[PDB]
mmCIF file of C-alpha atoms in Angstrom:
data_model
loop_
_atom_site.group_PDB
_atom_site.id
_atom_site.type_symbol
_atom_site.label_atom_id
_atom_site.label_comp_id
_atom_site.label_asym_id
_atom_site.label_seq_id
_atom_site.Cartn_x
_atom_site.Cartn_y
_atom_site.Cartn_z
ATOM 1 C CA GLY A 3 -9.385 0.388 15.481
ATOM 2 C CA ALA A 4 -6.041 1.766 13.595
ATOM 3 C CA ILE A 5 -5.280 1.251 9.308
ATOM 4 C CA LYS A 6 -1.880 -0.557 8.990
ATOM 5 C CA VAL A 7 -0.441 -1.318 6.493
ATOM 6 C CA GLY A 8 1.981 -3.428 5.856
ATOM 7 C CA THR A 9 4.970 -5.046 6.672
ATOM 8 C CA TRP A 10 7.342 -5.312 3.410
ATOM 9 C CA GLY A 11 10.170 -7.670 4.637
ATOM 10 C CA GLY A 12 11.561 -9.842 6.418
ATOM 11 C CA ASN A 13 11.307 -12.415 9.771
ATOM 12 C CA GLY A 14 14.077 -11.205 11.558
ATOM 13 C CA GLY A 15 15.158 -8.666 14.636
ATOM 14 C CA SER A 16 12.150 -7.607 17.091
ATOM 15 C CA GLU A 17 9.358 -5.803 16.852
ATOM 16 C CA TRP A 18 9.066 -1.945 16.948
ATOM 17 C CA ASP A 19 5.311 0.215 16.840
ATOM 18 C CA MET A 20 5.882 4.098 16.428
ATOM 19 C CA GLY A 21 2.212 4.714 17.167
ATOM 20 C CA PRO A 22 0.490 7.086 14.975
ATOM 21 C CA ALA A 23 1.031 11.019 14.873
ATOM 22 C CA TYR A 24 -0.156 14.441 14.920
ATOM 23 C CA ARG A 25 2.573 16.223 13.030
ATOM 24 C CA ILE A 26 6.015 14.342 11.622
ATOM 25 C CA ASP A 27 8.902 16.735 12.530
ATOM 26 C CA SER A 28 11.456 15.634 9.911
ATOM 27 C CA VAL A 29 13.184 12.331 9.468
ATOM 28 C CA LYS A 30 16.650 10.897 9.034
ATOM 29 C CA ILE A 31 17.300 7.227 7.697
ATOM 30 C CA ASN A 32 20.909 5.996 8.226
ATOM 31 C CA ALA A 33 21.488 4.012 4.493
ATOM 32 C CA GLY A 34 24.570 1.370 3.183
ATOM 33 C CA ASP A 35 24.476 -1.202 0.889
ATOM 34 C CA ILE A 36 21.281 -1.595 2.653
ATOM 35 C CA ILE A 37 18.602 0.812 5.080
ATOM 36 C CA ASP A 38 20.312 0.813 8.462
ATOM 37 C CA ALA A 39 18.274 2.183 10.298
ATOM 38 C CA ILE A 40 14.668 5.201 10.522
ATOM 39 C CA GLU A 41 14.976 7.931 13.321
ATOM 40 C CA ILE A 42 11.227 10.278 13.610
ATOM 41 C CA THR A 43 11.006 13.176 15.370
ATOM 42 C CA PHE A 44 6.490 13.808 15.824
ATOM 43 C CA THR A 45 4.398 15.309 18.495
ATOM 44 C CA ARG A 46 1.169 13.848 19.272
ATOM 45 C CA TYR A 47 -1.242 15.303 22.562
ATOM 46 C CA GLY A 48 0.964 18.496 22.806
ATOM 47 C CA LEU A 49 4.117 16.347 23.356
ATOM 48 C CA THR A 50 6.875 16.635 20.660
ATOM 49 C CA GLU A 51 8.805 12.411 20.392
ATOM 50 C CA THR A 52 11.965 11.264 18.793
ATOM 51 C CA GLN A 53 12.356 7.440 17.910
ATOM 52 C CA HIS A 54 15.462 5.204 16.575
ATOM 53 C CA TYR A 55 14.069 2.160 14.528
ATOM 54 C CA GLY A 56 17.701 -0.149 13.481
ATOM 55 C CA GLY A 57 21.700 0.118 14.150
ATOM 56 C CA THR A 58 24.302 2.468 14.309
ATOM 57 C CA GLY A 59 25.766 2.206 10.270
ATOM 58 C CA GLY A 60 24.652 3.945 7.695
ATOM 59 C CA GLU A 61 25.569 7.172 6.802
ATOM 60 C CA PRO A 62 22.349 9.809 7.831
ATOM 61 C CA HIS A 63 19.620 11.327 5.582
ATOM 62 C CA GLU A 64 17.524 14.117 6.989
ATOM 63 C CA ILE A 65 14.517 15.693 6.401
ATOM 64 C CA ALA A 66 12.762 18.641 8.671
ATOM 65 C CA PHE A 67 9.108 18.820 7.867
ATOM 66 C CA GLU A 68 7.131 21.937 6.504
ATOM 67 C CA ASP A 69 4.476 23.168 7.908
ATOM 68 C CA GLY A 70 1.255 21.634 6.376
ATOM 69 C CA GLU A 71 4.027 18.995 4.690
ATOM 70 C CA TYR A 72 2.958 15.104 5.058
ATOM 71 C CA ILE A 73 3.821 11.735 4.051
ATOM 72 C CA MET A 74 1.465 10.816 1.258
ATOM 73 C CA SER A 75 4.304 7.445 -0.018
ATOM 74 C CA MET A 76 6.325 5.336 1.508
ATOM 75 C CA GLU A 77 8.615 3.111 -1.702
ATOM 76 C CA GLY A 78 11.447 0.739 -1.710
ATOM 77 C CA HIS A 79 12.847 -3.138 -2.287
ATOM 78 C CA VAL A 80 13.528 -5.583 -0.025
ATOM 79 C CA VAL A 81 16.298 -7.451 -0.520
ATOM 80 C CA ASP A 82 18.682 -9.990 0.662
ATOM 81 C CA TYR A 83 21.492 -9.307 2.308
ATOM 82 C CA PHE A 84 23.691 -11.879 2.957
ATOM 83 C CA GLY A 85 21.616 -14.130 3.360
ATOM 84 C CA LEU A 86 19.128 -12.028 5.939
ATOM 85 C CA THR A 87 15.768 -10.569 4.527
ATOM 86 C CA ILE A 88 15.207 -6.858 4.864
ATOM 87 C CA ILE A 89 15.250 -3.784 3.942
ATOM 88 C CA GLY A 90 17.696 -2.243 0.617
ATOM 89 C CA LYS A 91 16.360 0.080 -0.172
ATOM 90 C CA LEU A 92 13.674 3.355 0.914
ATOM 91 C CA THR A 93 12.103 6.707 -0.456
ATOM 92 C CA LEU A 94 9.150 8.512 1.848
ATOM 93 C CA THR A 95 7.650 11.583 -0.635
ATOM 94 C CA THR A 96 6.101 14.186 0.343
ATOM 95 C CA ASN A 97 2.832 16.867 -0.744
ATOM 96 C CA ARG A 98 5.782 19.163 -1.934
ATOM 97 C CA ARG A 99 8.951 16.642 -1.715
ATOM 98 C CA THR A 100 11.061 13.574 -2.603
ATOM 99 C CA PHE A 101 13.361 10.995 0.282
ATOM 100 C CA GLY A 102 15.355 9.737 -1.017
ATOM 101 C CA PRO A 103 15.946 6.726 -2.787
ATOM 102 C CA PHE A 104 17.901 5.081 -0.393
ATOM 103 C CA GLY A 105 19.894 2.171 -0.589
ATOM 104 C CA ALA A 106 21.771 -0.140 -2.904
ATOM 105 C CA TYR A 107 20.381 -2.945 -2.636
ATOM 106 C CA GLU A 108 17.633 -4.125 -4.463
ATOM 107 C CA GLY A 109 15.009 -7.474 -4.697
ATOM 108 C CA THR A 110 11.217 -6.618 -4.665
ATOM 109 C CA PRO A 111 9.996 -3.974 -4.710
ATOM 110 C CA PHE A 112 6.382 -2.288 -2.981
ATOM 111 C CA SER A 113 5.059 1.010 -3.036
ATOM 112 C CA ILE A 114 2.225 2.496 -1.060
ATOM 113 C CA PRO A 115 0.873 5.431 -2.604
ATOM 114 C CA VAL A 116 -1.670 7.265 -1.026
ATOM 115 C CA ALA A 117 -3.965 9.670 -2.992
ATOM 116 C CA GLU A 118 -5.948 11.052 -0.248
ATOM 117 C CA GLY A 119 -5.071 10.688 3.377
ATOM 118 C CA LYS A 120 -1.477 10.485 4.652
ATOM 119 C CA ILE A 121 1.145 8.187 6.716
ATOM 120 C CA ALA A 122 1.385 9.488 10.052
ATOM 121 C CA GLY A 123 3.528 6.964 11.285
ATOM 122 C CA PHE A 124 4.939 4.025 11.208
ATOM 123 C CA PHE A 125 5.976 -0.372 12.536
ATOM 124 C CA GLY A 126 8.460 -2.784 11.453
ATOM 125 C CA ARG A 127 11.075 -4.763 12.197
ATOM 126 C CA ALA A 128 14.072 -4.098 13.751
ATOM 127 C CA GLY A 129 18.213 -5.754 15.119
ATOM 128 C CA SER A 130 21.122 -4.379 13.818
ATOM 129 C CA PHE A 131 19.428 -2.746 10.292
ATOM 130 C CA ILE A 132 15.597 -1.770 9.275
ATOM 131 C CA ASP A 133 13.983 -5.957 8.743
ATOM 132 C CA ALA A 134 10.573 -4.582 7.873
ATOM 133 C CA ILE A 135 8.751 -1.869 7.722
ATOM 134 C CA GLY A 136 5.198 -0.594 7.492
ATOM 135 C CA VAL A 137 2.043 2.891 7.784
ATOM 136 C CA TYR A 138 -0.121 3.900 10.098
ATOM 137 C CA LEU A 139 -2.626 5.918 7.823
ATOM 138 C CA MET A 140 -5.034 8.518 8.350
ATOM 139 C CA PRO A 141 -7.418 10.701 7.087
ATOM 140 C CA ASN A 142 -5.901 14.785 6.112
ATOM 141 C CA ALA B 2 -15.653 12.884 4.168
ATOM 142 C CA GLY B 3 -12.387 11.576 5.884
ATOM 143 C CA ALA B 4 -11.899 8.646 3.153
ATOM 144 C CA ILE B 5 -8.474 5.822 3.868
ATOM 145 C CA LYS B 6 -7.555 5.585 -1.005
ATOM 146 C CA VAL B 7 -4.535 3.773 -1.558
ATOM 147 C CA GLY B 8 -2.436 3.472 -4.476
ATOM 148 C CA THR B 9 -3.166 3.688 -8.382
ATOM 149 C CA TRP B 10 -0.473 1.548 -9.396
ATOM 150 C CA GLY B 11 -0.487 0.931 -12.726
ATOM 151 C CA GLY B 12 -0.365 3.293 -16.169
ATOM 152 C CA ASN B 13 -1.266 6.429 -17.076
ATOM 153 C CA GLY B 14 -3.815 4.818 -19.943
ATOM 154 C CA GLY B 15 -7.624 4.281 -19.399
ATOM 155 C CA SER B 16 -10.015 6.387 -18.561
ATOM 156 C CA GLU B 17 -10.703 6.264 -14.386
ATOM 157 C CA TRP B 18 -13.070 5.102 -12.271
ATOM 158 C CA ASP B 19 -14.131 5.161 -8.908
ATOM 159 C CA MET B 20 -16.150 3.102 -6.536
ATOM 160 C CA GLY B 21 -16.945 4.759 -3.398
ATOM 161 C CA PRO B 22 -15.923 3.459 0.152
ATOM 162 C CA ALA B 23 -18.673 0.617 0.910
ATOM 163 C CA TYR B 24 -20.166 0.055 3.613
ATOM 164 C CA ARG B 25 -20.263 -3.831 2.262
ATOM 165 C CA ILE B 26 -19.044 -5.351 -0.791
ATOM 166 C CA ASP B 27 -21.307 -8.608 -1.159
ATOM 167 C CA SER B 28 -19.001 -10.329 -4.381
ATOM 168 C CA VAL B 29 -16.186 -9.360 -7.030
ATOM 169 C CA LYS B 30 -15.757 -10.880 -10.315
ATOM 170 C CA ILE B 31 -12.739 -10.491 -11.988
ATOM 171 C CA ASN B 32 -12.424 -11.527 -15.281
ATOM 172 C CA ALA B 33 -8.969 -12.561 -16.826
ATOM 173 C CA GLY B 34 -6.707 -14.027 -19.160
ATOM 174 C CA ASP B 35 -2.575 -13.122 -19.752
ATOM 175 C CA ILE B 36 -3.970 -9.879 -18.050
ATOM 176 C CA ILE B 37 -6.619 -8.668 -16.213
ATOM 177 C CA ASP B 38 -9.525 -7.507 -18.510
ATOM 178 C CA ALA B 39 -11.791 -6.051 -15.643
ATOM 179 C CA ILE B 40 -13.022 -6.437 -12.938
ATOM 180 C CA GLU B 41 -16.981 -5.783 -11.047
ATOM 181 C CA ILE B 42 -17.709 -4.931 -7.606
ATOM 182 C CA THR B 43 -21.709 -5.837 -6.283
ATOM 183 C CA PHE B 44 -22.015 -3.690 -2.722
ATOM 184 C CA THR B 45 -23.991 -1.787 -0.501
ATOM 185 C CA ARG B 46 -23.838 1.646 0.759
ATOM 186 C CA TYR B 47 -27.214 3.854 1.679
ATOM 187 C CA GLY B 48 -29.890 0.514 1.623
ATOM 188 C CA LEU B 49 -29.101 0.539 -2.194
ATOM 189 C CA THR B 50 -26.954 -2.955 -3.554
ATOM 190 C CA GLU B 51 -25.085 -2.416 -6.965
ATOM 191 C CA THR B 52 -22.666 -3.595 -9.219
ATOM 192 C CA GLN B 53 -19.796 -1.648 -10.920
ATOM 193 C CA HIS B 54 -18.123 -2.812 -13.889
ATOM 194 C CA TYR B 55 -14.490 -1.697 -15.006
ATOM 195 C CA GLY B 56 -13.078 -2.476 -18.655
ATOM 196 C CA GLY B 57 -13.517 -4.689 -21.390
ATOM 197 C CA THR B 58 -14.907 -7.357 -22.788
ATOM 198 C CA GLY B 59 -12.762 -9.672 -22.540
ATOM 199 C CA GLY B 60 -10.653 -12.965 -20.779
ATOM 200 C CA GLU B 61 -12.308 -15.630 -19.075
ATOM 201 C CA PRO B 62 -14.246 -14.505 -15.113
ATOM 202 C CA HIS B 63 -13.738 -15.991 -11.965
ATOM 203 C CA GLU B 64 -15.618 -14.638 -8.836
ATOM 204 C CA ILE B 65 -16.175 -14.265 -5.009
ATOM 205 C CA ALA B 66 -19.729 -14.201 -2.870
ATOM 206 C CA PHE B 67 -18.388 -12.399 0.620
ATOM 207 C CA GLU B 68 -19.669 -14.358 3.267
ATOM 208 C CA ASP B 69 -20.926 -13.407 6.625
ATOM 209 C CA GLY B 70 -18.115 -11.209 8.732
ATOM 210 C CA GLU B 71 -15.574 -12.413 5.488
ATOM 211 C CA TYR B 72 -13.681 -8.944 4.839
ATOM 212 C CA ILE B 73 -10.714 -8.146 2.673
ATOM 213 C CA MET B 74 -7.269 -7.725 4.171
ATOM 214 C CA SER B 75 -4.827 -7.350 1.069
ATOM 215 C CA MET B 76 -4.495 -6.978 -2.315
ATOM 216 C CA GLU B 77 -1.193 -7.869 -4.407
ATOM 217 C CA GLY B 78 -0.618 -7.820 -7.841
ATOM 218 C CA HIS B 79 1.627 -7.137 -11.204
ATOM 219 C CA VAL B 80 2.056 -4.248 -13.374
ATOM 220 C CA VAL B 81 3.413 -5.313 -16.405
ATOM 221 C CA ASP B 82 4.217 -4.159 -20.524
ATOM 222 C CA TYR B 83 1.727 -5.562 -22.253
ATOM 223 C CA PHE B 84 1.988 -5.004 -26.531
ATOM 224 C CA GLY B 85 3.141 -1.705 -25.023
ATOM 225 C CA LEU B 86 0.558 -0.701 -22.551
ATOM 226 C CA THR B 87 1.398 -0.795 -18.880
ATOM 227 C CA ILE B 88 -1.547 -2.069 -17.566
ATOM 228 C CA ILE B 89 -2.608 -4.940 -14.694
ATOM 229 C CA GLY B 90 -1.450 -8.513 -15.395
ATOM 230 C CA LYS B 91 -2.113 -10.253 -12.342
ATOM 231 C CA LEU B 92 -4.385 -10.132 -9.755
ATOM 232 C CA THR B 93 -5.094 -11.864 -5.775
ATOM 233 C CA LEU B 94 -7.754 -10.939 -3.707
ATOM 234 C CA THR B 95 -6.763 -11.882 0.213
ATOM 235 C CA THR B 96 -9.860 -12.195 2.525
ATOM 236 C CA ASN B 97 -9.911 -12.864 6.672
ATOM 237 C CA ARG B 98 -10.360 -17.245 5.282
ATOM 238 C CA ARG B 99 -10.316 -17.340 1.742
ATOM 239 C CA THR B 100 -7.081 -16.481 -1.564
ATOM 240 C CA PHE B 101 -8.978 -15.539 -4.827
ATOM 241 C CA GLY B 102 -6.808 -15.553 -6.862
ATOM 242 C CA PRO B 103 -3.487 -15.041 -8.502
ATOM 243 C CA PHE B 104 -5.898 -14.564 -11.961
ATOM 244 C CA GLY B 105 -3.859 -12.778 -14.882
ATOM 245 C CA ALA B 106 -1.245 -14.515 -16.581
ATOM 246 C CA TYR B 107 1.883 -11.850 -16.744
ATOM 247 C CA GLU B 108 4.072 -10.462 -14.055
ATOM 248 C CA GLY B 109 6.783 -7.270 -13.983
ATOM 249 C CA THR B 110 6.812 -4.805 -11.019
ATOM 250 C CA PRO B 111 5.081 -6.423 -8.055
ATOM 251 C CA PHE B 112 3.012 -4.693 -5.755
ATOM 252 C CA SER B 113 0.466 -5.793 -2.037
ATOM 253 C CA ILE B 114 -1.579 -4.373 0.242
ATOM 254 C CA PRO B 115 -0.433 -6.268 3.497
ATOM 255 C CA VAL B 116 -3.529 -4.782 5.920
ATOM 256 C CA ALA B 117 -2.594 -5.662 9.440
ATOM 257 C CA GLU B 118 -5.426 -3.592 11.583
ATOM 258 C CA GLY B 119 -8.366 -2.627 8.870
ATOM 259 C CA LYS B 120 -10.057 -3.257 6.180
ATOM 260 C CA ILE B 121 -10.421 -2.853 1.812
ATOM 261 C CA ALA B 122 -13.519 -1.151 1.625
ATOM 262 C CA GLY B 123 -13.946 -0.025 -2.181
ATOM 263 C CA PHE B 124 -11.793 0.350 -5.128
ATOM 264 C CA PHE B 125 -10.092 2.730 -7.950
ATOM 265 C CA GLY B 126 -8.751 2.636 -11.194
ATOM 266 C CA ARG B 127 -7.726 3.469 -14.409
ATOM 267 C CA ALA B 128 -9.595 0.902 -17.600
ATOM 268 C CA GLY B 129 -9.989 1.151 -21.034
ATOM 269 C CA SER B 130 -10.159 -2.282 -22.955
ATOM 270 C CA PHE B 131 -8.268 -3.391 -19.768
ATOM 271 C CA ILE B 132 -7.892 -2.725 -16.396
ATOM 272 C CA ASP B 133 -4.663 0.367 -17.232
ATOM 273 C CA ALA B 134 -4.342 0.992 -12.783
ATOM 274 C CA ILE B 135 -6.296 -0.541 -9.488
ATOM 275 C CA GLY B 136 -6.335 1.227 -5.894
ATOM 276 C CA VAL B 137 -8.369 0.639 -2.638
ATOM 277 C CA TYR B 138 -10.777 2.257 0.103
ATOM 278 C CA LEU B 139 -9.032 1.412 3.853
ATOM 279 C CA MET B 140 -11.446 1.139 7.119
ATOM 280 C CA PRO B 141 -11.475 0.002 10.742
ATOM 281 C CA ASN B 142 -11.991 -3.574 11.655
#
């Protein structure tokens, strides 16, 4: 019933799945050389929730979405990080702003620009880092 | 009408084209040599089956006729520099049963659309002599 695109990344870590949200309120990405973590605050069915995926490392970067602001694209790199296949660079683009790039490693690029509709949530794999990531797509 | 469109990947040249979403994709023909010259899709929507060709007249053709219950679940390829133009140099379509491609010989910046849940139901992009850019419509299964 859902539209899920991904994942991009490795087979390490544990599977995680935020599910789609009615509204994404804010995102925090922790990154150093690679993407350590992603945290999302979102609202659905009248309730707000915060979910954190990944480890404790990296410098934090946060965006609080404006009213009418939605995620239009995600892009990054799947990298080799000391033998691990993980997310090394990540950017989220909204209808108004660019959030990123964060991370310093490159490898195999991926990009998911949404010409019609929106990125409504995320899924992926994580342990100490973000091993893999994917998106839920919903109509606008 | 609540469509979900992802893309485009490719250059800014060529003229825009858009097949729209289809009820069923019947067949796809890709013409390729060094790069992706053309894509032709036969699809059904509202009791009508039609064929639309995008791109030029070059390259060798290859075709897939979809089986009953067969749907597209992935698209991947390369955005490349071809004599200074930025176009699609390699393309593959993967169904729940078969891999169609890869076609084309040039590499550059890879792109990939793995559909974990749902299907690719149509295409849009830019084209002139070749396929400058490509994108897809998505639907649930």
